[PDB]
Each structure stands twice: as C-alpha cells, then as structure tokens.
Design a binder for this molecule. Sequence first.
Ligand SMILES: [K+]
Ligand SMILES: [K+]
Ligand SMILES: [K+]
Ligand SMILES: [K+]
Ligand SMILES: [K+]
Ligand SMILES: [Mg+2]
Ligand SMILES: [Mg+2]
Ligand SMILES: [Mg+2]
Ligand SMILES: [Mg+2]
Ligand SMILES: [Mg+2]
Ligand SMILES: [Mg+2]
Ligand SMILES: [Mg+2]
Ligand SMILES: [Mg+2]
Ligand SMILES: [Mg+2]
Ligand SMILES: [Mg+2]
Ligand SMILES: [Mg+2]
Ligand SMILES: [Mg+2]
Ligand SMILES: [Mg+2]
Ligand SMILES: [Mg+2]
Ligand SMILES: [Mg+2]
Ligand SMILES: [Mg+2]
Ligand SMILES: [Mg+2]
Ligand SMILES: [Mg+2]
Ligand SMILES: [Mg+2]
Ligand SMILES: [Mg+2]
Ligand SMILES: [Mg+2]
Ligand SMILES: [Mg+2]
Ligand SMILES: [Mg+2]
Ligand SMILES: [Mg+2]
Ligand SMILES: [Mg+2]
Ligand SMILES: [Mg+2]
Ligand SMILES: [Mg+2]
Ligand SMILES: [Mg+2]
Ligand SMILES: [Mg+2]
Ligand SMILES: [Mg+2]
Ligand SMILES: [Mg+2]
Ligand SMILES: [Mg+2]
Ligand SMILES: [Mg+2]
Ligand SMILES: [Mg+2]
Ligand SMILES: [Mg+2]
Ligand SMILES: [Mg+2]
Ligand SMILES: [Mg+2]
Ligand SMILES: [Mg+2]
Ligand SMILES: [Mg+2]
Ligand SMILES: [Mg+2]
Ligand SMILES: [Mg+2]
Ligand SMILES: [Mg+2]
Ligand SMILES: [Mg+2]
Ligand SMILES: [Mg+2]
Ligand SMILES: [Mg+2]
Ligand SMILES: [Mg+2]
Ligand SMILES: [Mg+2]
Ligand code: NA
Ligand code: NA
Ligand code: NA
Ligand code: NA
Ligand SMILES: [Zn+2]
Lengths: 48, 57, 113, 127, 123
Amino acid sequence: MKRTYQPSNRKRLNKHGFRSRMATANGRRVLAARRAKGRAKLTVSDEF
Amino acid sequence: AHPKRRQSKTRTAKRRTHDKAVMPTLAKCPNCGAWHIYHTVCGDCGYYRGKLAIEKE
Amino acid sequence: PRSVNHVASRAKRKRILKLTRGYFGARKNVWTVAKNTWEKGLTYAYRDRKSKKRNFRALWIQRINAAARLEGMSYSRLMGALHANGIEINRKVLADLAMNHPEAFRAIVAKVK
Amino acid sequence: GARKHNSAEARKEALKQMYFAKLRNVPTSPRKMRLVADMIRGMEVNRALGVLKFSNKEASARVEKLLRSAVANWEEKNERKAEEGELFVSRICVDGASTLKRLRPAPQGRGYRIRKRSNHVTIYVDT
Amino acid sequence: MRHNKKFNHLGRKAAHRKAMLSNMAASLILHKRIFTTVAKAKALRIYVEPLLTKTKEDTTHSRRIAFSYLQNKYALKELFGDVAAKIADRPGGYTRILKTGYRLGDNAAMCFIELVDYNENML
RNA sequence: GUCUCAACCGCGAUCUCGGUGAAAUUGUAGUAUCGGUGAAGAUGCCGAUUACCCGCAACGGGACGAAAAGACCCCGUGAA
RNA sequence: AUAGUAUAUCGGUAGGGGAGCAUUCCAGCGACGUAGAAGGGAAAAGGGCGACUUUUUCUGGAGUUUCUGGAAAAGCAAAUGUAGGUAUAAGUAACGAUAAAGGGGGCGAGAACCCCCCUCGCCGAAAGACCAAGGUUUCCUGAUCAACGCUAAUCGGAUCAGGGUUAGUCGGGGCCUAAGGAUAAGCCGAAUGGCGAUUCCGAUGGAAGAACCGGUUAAUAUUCCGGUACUGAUAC
RNA sequence: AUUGACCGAUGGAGUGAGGGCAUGGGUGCUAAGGUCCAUGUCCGAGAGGAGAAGAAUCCGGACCACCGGCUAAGGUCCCG
RNA sequence: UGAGGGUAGGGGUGAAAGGCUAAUCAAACUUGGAGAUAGCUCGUACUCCCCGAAAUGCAUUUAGGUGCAGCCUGUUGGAU
RNA sequence: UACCGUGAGGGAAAGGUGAAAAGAACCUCGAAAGAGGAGUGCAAUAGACCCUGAACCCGUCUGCCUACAAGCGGUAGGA
RNA sequence: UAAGGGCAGACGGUGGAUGCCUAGGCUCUCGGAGGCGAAGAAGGACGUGAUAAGCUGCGAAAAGCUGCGGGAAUCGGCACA
Ligand SMILES: [K+]
Ligand SMILES: [K+]
Ligand SMILES: [K+]
Ligand SMILES: [K+]
Ligand SMILES: [K+]
Ligand SMILES: [Mg+2]
Ligand SMILES: [Mg+2]
Ligand SMILES: [Mg+2]
Ligand SMILES: [Mg+2]
Ligand SMILES: [Mg+2]
Ligand SMILES: [Mg+2]
Ligand SMILES: [Mg+2]
Ligand SMILES: [Mg+2]
Ligand SMILES: [Mg+2]
Ligand SMILES: [Mg+2]
Ligand SMILES: [Mg+2]
Ligand SMILES: [Mg+2]
Ligand SMILES: [Mg+2]
Ligand SMILES: [Mg+2]
Ligand SMILES: [Mg+2]
Ligand SMILES: [Mg+2]
Ligand SMILES: [Mg+2]
Ligand SMILES: [Mg+2]
Ligand SMILES: [Mg+2]
Ligand SMILES: [Mg+2]
Ligand SMILES: [Mg+2]
Ligand SMILES: [Mg+2]
Ligand SMILES: [Mg+2]
Ligand SMILES: [Mg+2]
Ligand SMILES: [Mg+2]
Ligand SMILES: [Mg+2]
Ligand SMILES: [Mg+2]
Ligand SMILES: [Mg+2]
Ligand SMILES: [Mg+2]
Ligand SMILES: [Mg+2]
Ligand SMILES: [Mg+2]
Ligand SMILES: [Mg+2]
Ligand SMILES: [Mg+2]
Ligand SMILES: [Mg+2]
Ligand SMILES: [Mg+2]
Ligand SMILES: [Mg+2]
Ligand SMILES: [Mg+2]
Ligand SMILES: [Mg+2]
Ligand SMILES: [Mg+2]
Ligand SMILES: [Mg+2]
Ligand SMILES: [Mg+2]
Ligand SMILES: [Mg+2]
Ligand SMILES: [Mg+2]
Ligand SMILES: [Mg+2]
Ligand SMILES: [Mg+2]
Ligand SMILES: [Mg+2]
Ligand SMILES: [Mg+2]
Ligand code: NA
Ligand code: NA
Ligand code: NA
Ligand code: NA
Ligand SMILES: [Zn+2]
C-alpha cells in the first residue's frame, strides 16, 4: 500500500530548508532554539 | 491454550527422560581394522563383504 | 549524606535462607517464596509444641492400658484404684514401667487389686 | 606479601596430575551438546572416537577433535604414547557460555528476541 | 492407508517424478555408476531394469519404445551399443545398490547404484 | 456433493530424522474421582473411592482458561 | 503497673503511648591493618526478648573502627511499579507464495545449496530491455567467513583493500515565462507585521545552437576509437 | 462489696458500608442467609476443644517453656 | 495519472460518512502553564513492650465525603 | 552523539589488567577456532569482555532416599 | 534396582551485585567582568600530515609563518608503530 512518506528533494528543501527557516521570525526562533541546544544537524540542509 | 503455571525444574526434567542421542551401529572392518557402520562400505579401504567396491585413488 | 545499607540489607536475607535449606523446589532458595514458607512453618511449630503434650499423654495411656489388661484390669479401673489409694505416680513413669520394667508395674497392680 | 604466591604454588602442583582439554565459546546450544556428552561418558577412548565419527549429531565433530587433544595432553604429561584399551573418558561436562541476542520481526510491527547460545566443553581422561 | 500401493511418490508431483526417473536413468547408462540417496536409488531400480531388458530384442520398435522413456539420443546410442552386449546373458538383476553413509547438510542416507557388468572387482 | 450420505484420488501443511530456533502465559506445586461443606458452582477442606514410574500422537469438558483496570447499569457537587 | 521482694495484670484490627537496633557522614578521646583492611563463601557461639552482635577458617589485596555526643538521600514482599540479568512454555511454532529438480567434473579441512558441463522445469505486453524519482558505491577485482544471510557455505547486495563514471551537440544549466512567491511606489496595522506592479524569482511548458551508426574494458561510452554530419564564436 | 473500673482540663486519634444469634415488634406471605427498630451477646478485632468438614451453635479469653496433674462441653466397640 | 504550487486547528476541506487533515480526529501534533485537579483505586519498607475502639445521633447540592457529639489513648488534677 | 520523527521535537547505553606491557618467543593436539604446556610477573582462577566477583539460573561428582503411591509441600515425632 | 527424580555438600559455568577507587557532577563563598559584529560576528561547509578515518589546531603562508621577553634538552597534537 501507499505509505505516508513519498520523498522529493525539491519539496523537502522548500518546506524545511535553511532558506525557508530564515525567511520568517518564527523560523529564526526555531534556529535559535536548536543552536542553544547544541544540535549537530541544524536543518534538513545539513544531512544532504 | 496458555500455561496456567510455569513448570518446575522437576517436571521439565522428567519429560526430558526420553531425549537421547541414538548410538551408531558400528562394526570393525575385517580388512582395514577400522570402525564402520554395519551394512555399509568402509570409507577407509573401500571394501565391502570381503570384496573391493570403491577403488579409491 | 547519602545512606544505603547494602551489606546489612543483604545479610538479613542470607541468614534466613540458611534456615530454609532442605525444602522442595523454589521454596528453599527463591527469596519471596522461601520466606513465605519459613513464616508458615513457624506458625505450625507454636501449635505443634502444644499438641506434643497431648500426643505423649495419649501414648502413655495406651501402653498402660495394654499392661493392665494382661493382669485382668482395664485402664479406667486401674487408675480409679490408684487415685483411691493415694498413689501419685504419673503416667509417664507408669508407661515406662509397663514397657521396660514389667515386674515393678506388677507390684503397683498387686497393691491396689 | 607472598600469600597468593603460596596459594598458587599448590594449585600448579596438583595440575601436573590432571589430564584434560577444554573447548571455550563454542557457538552452539549447550542443551544439544549435552546430548552428545551423555553418550561417551565413562567410555573407552578408542571406542568413543569411532562413536563420535559416525554420530548423526552435528556437535560430535567438534567433540571428536577435543578428545584427540585430551589424549595428546595425557601423553605429554606422562612421557609415553598411550596404549590401546588403556585410557577412558573419566569426566565430561558442558556449561552454558555467553548468549548473542538478535531480533526477528513478527506480525503487526512487533519484534521478538532470538538467542544464539554458546557453550564450554571440558573432557578428562584416565588410565 | 496404502495397502498394496507399490510405488514411491518421492515427494514430487507425477510429472516431476517421471522426469527425474528419466534423467537419472540416462545418467546411469552414460556413467556406469552414480551416487544418490537410498530411496531414490531403490525407485530407479524398478524403472531402469525393464528398460535394459528391451535391448534383448534389437528392432526399430524396441529402440523407439526405449526412446519414448529417455528422450535422449546419446543414452539410446550407449544403451543399444556397449550396454546391450555386456548384459546379453544375465537373467535380470542388472544393477546393484550399496550403502555409503550420510550427507552433511540434511543427514540423508546415501548409496551408489551401478550396472553389475561394469564392476570388475565385484565381477 | 447444498443435501439423503458419504466414498476415493493429487500436491502443500501434518508426522519422523538432520540444521537453526521464537511467543503469548507463569505465587509455589508430588496438580486423580465422587458426594458433602463452604464468600452460597472445589485438584488443594471432610468422609470414602480409585491409582506402579516416565513419554508420544489425537480431542477440547474444567482450570469461573488467555487477552482488555466491563462499552451495559449505577455513582463522581468528573469531562467533552 | 502499684507499694516497697509482695499483690494485680500481660489475645488483639483502626488507632494512642514507651523503649531500642542497623545504615551514611561529623566532633572528641583512642585503636587495627601487606606478620593481611573492606567485601565475598563456610562454620560455631551469643542476646530479659528482638532489630542484631562476636569469633574461627578459605577467598581478597588496601583500607577499617570502639565509646560519648551530633546530623540524615536512615531499613521493601506485593504499587497490571522501573532498569539489568536469567528462566517457563520448548528443542515446541516457524524457516515468508506448491515455478522443480537430477547427474558428472572442480577448488577445498569441510559441499543438497559455490564454479563448469549435460539433462529437466518456470517467465516471455515479462519475472526481458531503456529512462525518471528516490538511493548513494550497493558497480569490478583480490583477500576473509568472526558478525550479517531465518540451514551449511569454499558463496553474497557481508568485512577490508585496490580500482572504476571521460561530451562544442545527450540530460541539465546559462534565455523565457505559468500557478504561486518576494518586492517597488503606495495602502493598512499594539508590536511581531498584512497587502500591494507591466518588476524579479519560479518548470511540470516555450527556445532561431547544433549527431547518428558501429566497435572496444574486469568495470565507461550519442562521452574513448572508426566512419559520416552538424552549430556558435574568433583571426586573416 | 469492688485491682481501682468514674470525672475535669489539656496533646493525639480512628470510626461515622456492619454482621449472626436469642428475646419484643413493624413490614413481607407468622416467606427469605429478606428488610427496619429496641434490649443483650458474640464475630468484626478472638486462637484452643466438641460438632466429619461451618465467622458469630455448645465449652472456653492464648506472657513464654515443660515427654507433669485436675477438669469443661462432649464422650468411653474399631478407624479415635 | 506525473511534476510543482495553495488552503492550518473551533481553523481547513467535505457529490455530507462527523468523513479526512502524516498508521492519531465530536477539535491534530510539539513544547510550555505543569508535579492542573482526582471527596476515586492501588501502594506505604527495622525491633520489642503497655493500652485499645467504631460501623450510632445531629447537620450537610448530603448519602462510599465532611463538622460536632458518642466510643480509644498520653499527661495532669480530683474523688467517684 | 547513536537512534526515533515530514517537521517542530524527543533522546540513550557505555568507568577500573598490571607497579611496570614485562600484553605470553617456542613446543603439543588440531585444516586453522580452542586448549595443554613453557615463559613474564607478588599474583595469569590478574590473559585482553582482564580488580573484587553475590543472587536468580545452569552443569559434573559424592552420600542418603525414591517405581502400591494421592492435596499450600511444612511442622512435631522417629528407625 | 534407578530409566529418571529429591535433598545436602564439593568444585565449576553464567551474570555483574557488592567493597574499594576517580577522570565527572552538585551547591555555594570571595574578587573581577558583563559583551562579539560591515576592519564581516555567533554558528557552519570544505580543506590542511611522510603516513591520516575521527577529534584537536589551523586556512591555499593551511598540526602552521615573523619579532620581543622567558626557559634549557629534548621535539615533529590526541597517538601509537
Ligand atoms: K567507607
Ligand atoms: K573470492
Ligand atoms: K483544536
Ligand atoms: K563466579
Ligand atoms: K515401595
Ligand atoms: Mg521428548
Ligand atoms: Mg550458533
Ligand atoms: Mg551429520
Ligand atoms: Mg510493517
Ligand atoms: Mg506432501
Ligand atoms: Mg527438527
Ligand atoms: Mg459443591
Ligand atoms: Mg470436588
Ligand atoms: Mg478469563
Ligand atoms: Mg473497572
Ligand atoms: Mg490472657
Ligand atoms: Mg497485647
Ligand atoms: Mg531510602
Ligand atoms: Mg499481565
Ligand atoms: Mg506443546
Ligand atoms: Mg507438533
Ligand atoms: Mg510466522
Ligand atoms: Mg511445523
Ligand atoms: Mg524460501
Ligand atoms: Mg522487468
Ligand atoms: Mg557484485
Ligand atoms: Mg551460517
Ligand atoms: Mg564485495
Ligand atoms: Mg542540450
Ligand atoms: Mg524572468
Ligand atoms: Mg554497465
Ligand atoms: Mg555508442
Ligand atoms: Mg456517611
Ligand atoms: Mg451508615
Ligand atoms: Mg440480613
Ligand atoms: Mg422481622
Ligand atoms: Mg443488607
Ligand atoms: Mg470479643
Ligand atoms: Mg451519525
Ligand atoms: Mg489517518
Ligand atoms: Mg475542546
Ligand atoms: Mg499553575
Ligand atoms: Mg499529575
Ligand atoms: Mg487488653
Ligand atoms: Mg461518594
Ligand atoms: Mg470526628
Ligand atoms: Mg582468585
Ligand atoms: Mg575478575
Ligand atoms: Mg494395594
Ligand atoms: Mg558460584
Ligand atoms: Mg560497582
Ligand atoms: Mg627567543
Ligand atoms: Na588470609
Ligand atoms: Na533492596
Ligand atoms: Na538413583
Ligand atoms: Na595567498
Ligand atoms: Zn576397512
């Protein structure tokens, strides 16, 4: 059967990528929380 | 369908009374002197019932 | 300070497990099973200390009954004759005399018969 | 302070009179191996080698090569080739070794554990 | 029940079983001895001995009847050539089965089957 | 062949042997039967009765068998 | 408990009261320890009673402790309680489409399963061939069989090392714009901000710049080589 | 007469689901191991003995030990 | 049917089943207020010694909760 | 961090040879894994998952009991 | 008698509790300080070695370059060969 995750690299970066996070105040708020935690992976732009 | 209780050590060991490895039926080869299974060709010499059966190089 | 009594807590269990040696199956060495069995046994012992006095007096009377009957007298009549004559020998002594020294028993019977 | 040296000296002097061989960490189940140990316990070594060679159990091939080692240890510690009809298996035991845990999927997303067991085998020989 | 049912199905469908017996028989005629399991070799004996009996009447009909079984022209060439001459006087019992031991992978009983007139040591 | 009313045949599973090897469940158990008794339907109490020790195959009457802190019903100065 | 040895009293759930033991650490006076401390195994003996204590011996190989007072992370049998380990059911269920296998050689300690050969069987609008998405070295070769592979394995999409992807034209990108997105001038609005062009971005579409057949490697091939073409720039 | 059993002040509670039996009653059917009151009692919170085995029927209130003695209810052919 | 866009939680979308909104829907998920509240259920660990209840009355959006009385216990003063 | 999740986010387990590597040349049985020796060392039952090394659970040996026997498995007697 | 079973002891297996220990935590006291960035920050990507996965340091001048002060025989990071 068709499952929930059907990958598309173009969709992934448009929805969760680094440049989309930086485009809004609430996205930059997410980046600040992940930096303060010390995450090695900041966005999906890192795993690529 | 389901065990009401775990079996004690005694009950498990009593059941395993009849779990025995079967001993081979062995015979000595009149030519080689080696053990072989009765009613089979000796794998060492190749002989069987006093005659050569598998001439081994 | 932080206080944990590891050695003391474990020593309490080990002492009792010496008392449960000889039991069947898990009742001898598995802690919560063995302690349960040991505690129940102590209740039996308190009751069985009392029943011991009952069982040994019943055994003395039975032996006295057999010895008296060999001399033409039942237990009830022999005891009635002893208490009438003031003899204060107790049943443990008489039963021992009945079994192991039959000639002394016969002298007590010949004094009240 | 020489105490453990004196305890160990006596331990080594006794080992000179014991003839044995060991198999450690055999990657098979101890219960199946025990089935083979009961077969050759207390049996003459020459007859046991043939019994192990033609056995239908797979654990027998490993045990056969351990009995050969036990005999060789005997001759090393006694300084002579063993006779025929002389030695016999005086002691044998199988003990469970460490277990390797694995996963096997089951229906509806559940997972179960598989145990891949091991064992140790020790053999003694005697004249 | 199987009272008086005298042939081994050999754990195969009928078409599979007939194909295996025919491949095995060709192997025995071409190579004078083959190694197989005991249950398979006892079933081949009932299959191949009547086929070897057909070489006592050398005709077109006998060759074609034999070919309807083997369907292999090299086996037919060998069967009606050298194999026919060796067995021309023996009254049945052309093959022999001798047990050898057990396989490593499934502990199957093993044996070898061969034509008697090609084993000189056993004559 | 739905049935009267079933019979037979083939392969896969099944059974035996070699190799590998789980799970639900589990206070301890040397866990028989009948009637009685009893938190009122007893393997475990009472009185009788029957029963040499230990497996394998096969079937499901009981262990108020397993699973899931009954959805029904009532209750909470509970919730949505 | 009362009187100072005598009289009385001593079954207990909820619950009230009294008196103690062990544990961690601190102060003080002091002790023990490589001629063997703590911990762990075994044995023996004590206590108005008990919580507990003491001694001997084996292991162990460096810390331990009496008494008086002080302070607490100060004691488990059960919470469908948590972690780790190990059992029972049990050598039981099962080993994942009933397309199928048999023989002879080979390497090898070892072969039902690996390689070669003969036969048999299955798919064949596919279970064959070429791309896209997605994956990211799984591709080829040598060595290895611990783990992985629902068996074994000399084999593998496994482990380690080495090697392997070649474009003026192919597919992209460079050019263009769609949905939509970001904006300019402006408009709206506690803040954060929301809207807003013919502007820009954005292919799944449009391009007036153009290549196809064959052969070679263990692994690349409109890319390398052969043959035959085409398209921009640039200099005379 | 009575081991002292009563009361005040003040510190700390738990309980506020009861139950069986006998007697006097209501209700019910002069039913219920039913229900609602009153007076005692026992179980609750109570072991031991008799009743074959029974929470409250009969006897009897367990400080500990004893291989001593006398009795209660109930018994004295055997299991006993 | 492929690619890429858009609508976001009392909101979306719905040829309307309270359907669907990442195996979750009569109000998604994540983090925080936060150890919400639970007159409810379950659980609550060393020793010996002395004493030892209640399951009634009144009131209560009260009836399986609670306040006061009644009945237990410590200390203290009186005799009753 | 690994791992889980489309994402926001959630989120582990895991310390100790010996004073010193002196970390076991060489031999024996094995195709080699494993062991028996030898050697180093206070100690190898300190041998690499290595200080000590408990329980549940699992073996072998020795002593006594057990195939006419029926219930929470003990307790009090007793050859 | 023991196919088997029960109990006790001896010796082992497994497992990793306990004792001892510390390399890391927890709560504070006293003093200072309270920023970095368009002369490009915080945080990252990619590189950098005789040898080079990963960390550390560094930036095509890349485990590093030049002076001044200190110090005195070893040194080329963790980290071996
Ligand atoms: K300490
Ligand atoms: K290879
Ligand atoms: K909502
Ligand atoms: K151990
Ligand atoms: K008997
Ligand atoms: Mg069996
Ligand atoms: Mg294995
Ligand atoms: Mg085999
Ligand atoms: Mg799935
Ligand atoms: Mg079949
Ligand atoms: Mg099997
Ligand atoms: Mg009944
Ligand atoms: Mg019954
Ligand atoms: Mg049920
Ligand atoms: Mg419920
Ligand atoms: Mg009293
Ligand atoms: Mg009392
Ligand atoms: Mg505590
Ligand atoms: Mg459960
Ligand atoms: Mg079964
Ligand atoms: Mg079965
Ligand atoms: Mg399955
Ligand atoms: Mg099966
Ligand atoms: Mg398969
Ligand atoms: Mg295809
Ligand atoms: Mg490949
Ligand atoms: Mg394998
Ligand atoms: Mg490979
Ligand atoms: Mg192009
Ligand atoms: Mg444009
Ligand atoms: Mg290719
Ligand atoms: Mg080409
Ligand atoms: Mg009330
Ligand atoms: Mg009430
Ligand atoms: Mg009533
Ligand atoms: Mg009435
Ligand atoms: Mg009622
Ligand atoms: Mg009372
Ligand atoms: Mg509806
Ligand atoms: Mg859904
Ligand atoms: Mg709501
Ligand atoms: Mg709040
Ligand atoms: Mg809460
Ligand atoms: Mg009292
Ligand atoms: Mg209520
Ligand atoms: Mg009150
Ligand atoms: Mg030691
Ligand atoms: Mg150790
Ligand atoms: Mg009889
Ligand atoms: Mg041990
Ligand atoms: Mg520790
Ligand atoms: Mg200088
Ligand atoms: Na010592
Ligand atoms: Na504990
Ligand atoms: Na026995
Ligand atoms: Na430069
Ligand atoms: Zn021979």
